[PDB]
């Protein structure tokens, strides 16, 4: 899993908005530096900037 290091406000209809400290699971990372993620915290799914999160156990 990953943890958000910053808040992120969606900038596209495909993005996932999140707050710092949310825990996310990566659904797919095969397209580039924007990863498809699912928030374990909020249940929402969408693309995130991969440099805004850090790995977690």
């Amino acid at each position: 899993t990953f943890v958000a290091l910053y808040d992120y406000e969606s900038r596209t209809e495909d993005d996932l908005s999140f707050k710092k400290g949310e825990r996310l699971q990566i659904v797919n990372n095969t397209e580039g530096d924007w990863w498809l993620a699912h928030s374990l915290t909020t249940g929402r799914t969408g693309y995130i900037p991969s440099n805004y999160v850090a790995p977690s156990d």
């Binding site: 910053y6 900038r11 397209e31 580039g32 530096d33 924007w34 693309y47 900037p49 991969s50 440099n51 805004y52």
Partner: peptide
């Protein structure tokens, strides 16, 4: 906050 990455390429 860091700059955002470029959007994904197909």
């Amino acid at each position: 906050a860091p700059p955002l990455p470029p959007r994904n390429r197909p």
